[PDB]
């Protein structure tokens with residue numbers, strides 16, 4: 001067993017594992033919650049003895065207890081070329097507000113009066129062991145698994161209200177994560193995964209993680225010199241070309257009624273409906 | 287449910303802190319018989335506790351972060367009018383925001399460990415705001431009602447990592463030990479007006495920063511209201527609201543920075559005091575802070 005998930009309504013999710021047929025099996029008999037500490041027991045469990053889940057439940061964020069999210073800026077060489085930007089010599093880092101975390105298929109709500117909402121399919125890395133000044137040679141051994149991410153962005157809030165990108169990155173619902181935490185033995189080389197994203201069934205982003213400027217090991221090593229990564233932390237590693245902001249002749253942005261569909265090889269798929277802003281009340285996402 | 291305010295704290299070694307309240311004589315009183323931990327959800331029961339009945343805490347225990355469960359830290363850039371004048375910077379038309387990585391959180395008097403090869407370490411005394419109720423597109427008129435209390439903060443900064451390794455400030459703000467918070471979570475009825483509090487920070491006994499929150503450009507209510515349109519603030523979240531003039535980076539004729547052996551001492555009216563000793567980098571191993 002190498003694909004883990006969390007299923008059910010928000011705030012009520014249960015731990016699960018994806019069997020060889022693609023069905024969810026309930027892990028509640030083995031571990032109470034899918035946390036990083038629970039991975040060893042969930043990885044050792046006998047799948048054929050776990051009950052099948054009924055009712056076609058919602059996928060939640062596949063790991064409970066993500067403490068913070070570190071985000072990487074320009075990190076695809078073919079993206080740098082398409083934007084006519086220089087190759088960064090060290091990775092741009094910014095924080096992806098934890099309150100943006102959402103389920104993989106959950107509704108994406110555009111911010112108030114937003115006309116610059118944008119998509120960013122990204123490889124997410126979930127840390128398994130504390131990363132504090134870790135060498136590049138040892139970095140990948142600190143990884144618990146990989147996840148599919150959409151780094152949803154508001155380009156006006158990101159770039160036209162100051163120099164700090166996080167202002168356009170932390171909105172409610174702007175970090176769909178999942179549906180699977182896939183352990184490294186199943187993922188293989190994280191630097192050979194096909195990546196894609198469509199909007200309304202029209203392909204917008206195509207790439208492969210081989211063209212990352214800083215690979216996952218380089219990113220973990222660098223980040224750990226500035227910000228300690230603890231088990232459960234998520235790092236989102238940048239996006240290939242094809243974001244709406246870069247479309248020619250004119251940029252293309254998200255609008256109400258759009259449907260985003262994205263996937264990364266071995267990490268499953270996401271589908272989000274995009275809705276216009278409304279006041280989301282006392283809802284606590286994640 | 288009285289309207290006189292409270293000074294809450296957490297006391298003990300790391301990972302073993304207990305909930306406390308400060309009495310009028312400055313003693314710590316043990317709250318463990320009333321609530322098991324000093325969380326936001328615990329505040330209701332904690333504020334109704336009769337201080338005179340609680341045990342005196344003996345000895346001089348370490349103060350921890352005064353509230354458990356801070357989920358994230360939102361930080362403001364330039365936000366004191368006198369700082370804008372001393373730096374000859376424009377008065378902002380909207381607040382600069384960045385995120386202070388949660389792993390920088392530390393107790394109020396805990397050692398500050400400089401990152402590797404740091405010669406640009408710097409101090410920033412700030413008024414911290416702990417959120418008590420969810421803030422989502424909240425108006426200025428209702429913002430302060432969402433506040434659980436106020437805390438003293440040092441927004442410790444590595445100016446080279448902050449500004450000379452790219453444009454994103456968080457890279458020089460998230461280092462281990464770079465957000466000492468405390469010693470007290472002070473509820474609004476005790477603080478009074480948050481926009482009339484004296485602020486200071488000394489380094490090795492020499493006064494570096496002097497100010498008063500009356501010169502804030504965006505007041506606390508305006509900051510909460512603005513931030514809440516871009517990022518939802520949940521109970522327990524911390525917002526650090528900027529710093530008065532006198533940071534080391536701004537000293538004339540030459541900037542002055544932290545070095546191993548330096549002592550930072552800071553305070554804000556009604557919020558207590560902090561003291562941090564500064565150390566050269568070492569590998570902190572598997573230690574967890576906060």
Ligand SMILES: [Mg+2]
Pocket residue numbers: 071072073120122151238239
């Ligand atoms: Mg991104």
Ligand SMILES: [Mg+2]
Pocket residue numbers: 361362363410412441526528529
């Ligand atoms: Mg500051």
